[PDB]
Design a protein around this ligand. Structure first.
Ligand code: HEM
Length: 291
C-alpha cells in the first residue's frame, strides 16, 4: 500500500486557515458541551483514533483514507463517544465541501490543541478519501486495563518509541473518561480544557488509590477527585517511562516541543509526500489574528 498525498485542487494556505478559523470559532461558541469542558478534548481524541489504526507492516489504516465516515469504523466500541466530535465537524464540512475527510479530522485535532493554548502543530494537507472496503477492522486501538509492557508493544505497531509514547500520553490531562463510553469515570486533573504538563505533575505528586468503579473496572483514584487509567499509571511503574515522566513534569517547554513532533508524526503516518508538495502549514490561532 502506497498512499500519496494530493493537494485538494487549487487550494493553498489561505483556504486551510479559513477551515481552521471556522473550527476554532465554533469551539468558542458551543462552549457548554460536557459540563462546560467544550469540544476541544473530544476533537483531539478523534484525530488520534482515526490515525491510531495505522499498521507500519502493511501500511493499512491511518488518517489518509478518512474511513471513520463508514459504519464499521464509526461503530467500533473503542470509538464510543467520538460521534460527538463528528457531529461538531459536520456543519464545517458542509461549509467547505472541497476538504477531504482525513484532512478535516486531522485539522480538527490540530485546531483544538492550539486553541486550548498548546504548542503549534505543523500540519500538511492532501489526504484522499478511499472506498468503504479500505476501512480497517475493529480491534486496532489499545485497551485501558493493561501494563507498561502492553503500551510499549502496542506503540511499536505505530512506530512510536518510549519518548514519543510518554509525550503523546500527556494529552490525558485533557477532558475526561466517561463511564457510559469506556467503563471508566473521571478527569485526570484540574485544568481539562487548557493544554499544560499537568498529567505528569499529577502522576508524580498525587496519592493514588486502586479502586473499583461502577462498571466493575479498576482505576487509580486520588483524594483530589482525579483518576488515572491502569495504562496511565504504568508510566511511573516502568523505569524507562518514569524518567521521561519526570523530565516533562520538570520542563513544560520540552514537553510542548516533543508533543508537537509526535502528534504531527501520528497524523502523517503512512502518507507519502511528493517533493513538489507544499511545506507544512503553521496556523495562526484566533488570538494572534485578533478574532
Ligand atoms: C495506551 C493508550 C491510550 C489508551 C488505552 C487510552 C484510553 C482512553 C480512554 C479509555 C479514554 C476515555 C474515553 C471516554 O470515556 O470518553 C480516553 C480519552 C482521551 N484520550 Fe486516550 N488513550 C490512550 C492514548 C491517547 C493518546 C495517544 C491521545 C492523544 C494524542 C489520547 C487522547 C485522549 C483524550 C484527549 C481523551 C479525552 C476525550 C474526552 O474528554 O472526551 N489518548 N483515553
Amino acid at each position: 500500500l502506497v498512499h500519496v498525498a494530493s493537494v485538494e485542487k487549487g487550494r493553498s494556505y489561505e483556504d486551510f486557515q479559513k477551515v481552521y478559523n471556522a473550527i476554532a470559532l465554533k469551539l468558542r461558541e458551543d462552549d457548554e458541551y460536557d459540563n462546560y469542558i467544550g469540544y476541544g478534548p473530544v476533537l483531539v481524541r478523534l484525530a488520534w483514533h482515526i490515525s491510531g489504526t495505522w499498521d507500519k507492516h502493511d501500511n493499512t489504516g491511518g488518517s489518509y483514507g478518512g474511513t471513520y465516515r463508514f459504519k464499521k469504523e464509526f461503530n467500533d466500541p473503542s470509538n464510543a463517544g467520538l460521534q460527538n466530535g463528528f457531529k461538531f465537524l459536520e456543519p464545517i464540512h458542509k461549509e467547505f465541501p472541497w476538504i477531504s475527510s482525513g484532512d478535516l479530522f486531522s485539522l480538527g485535532g490540530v485546531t483544538a490543541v492550539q486553541e486550548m493554548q498548546g504548542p503549534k502543530i505543523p500540519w500538511r494537507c492532501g489526504r484522499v478519501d478511499t472506498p468503504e472496503d479500505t476501512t480497517p477492522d475493529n480491534g486496532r486501538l489499545p485497551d485501558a486495563d493493561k501494563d507498561a509492557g502492553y503500551v510499549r508493544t502496542f506503540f511499536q505497531r505505530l512506530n512510536m518509541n518510549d519518548r514519543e509514547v510518554v509525550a503523546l500520553m500527556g494529552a490525558h490531562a485533557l477532558g475526561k473518561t466517561h463511564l457510559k463510553n469506556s467503563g471508566y469515570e473521571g478527569p485526570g486533573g484540574a485544568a481539562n480544557n487548557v493544554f499544560t504538563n499537568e498529567f505528569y505533575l499529577n502522576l508524580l505528586n498525587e496519592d493514588w488509590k486502586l479502586e473499583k468503579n461502577d462498571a466493575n473496572n479498576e482505576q487509580w483514584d486520588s483524594k483530589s477527585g482525579y483518576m488515572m487509567l491502569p495504562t496511565d499509571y504504568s508510566l511511573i511503574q516502568d523505569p524507562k517511562y518514569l524518567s521521561i515522566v519526570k523530565e516533562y513534569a520538570n520542563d513544560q517547554d520540552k514537553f510542548f516541543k516533543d508533543f508537537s513532533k509526535a502528534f504531527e508524526k501520528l497524523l502523517e503516518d503512512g502518507i507519502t509526500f511528493p517533493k513538489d508538495a507544499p511545506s507544512p502549514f503553521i496556523f495562526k490561532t484566533l488570538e494572534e489574528q485578533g478574532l
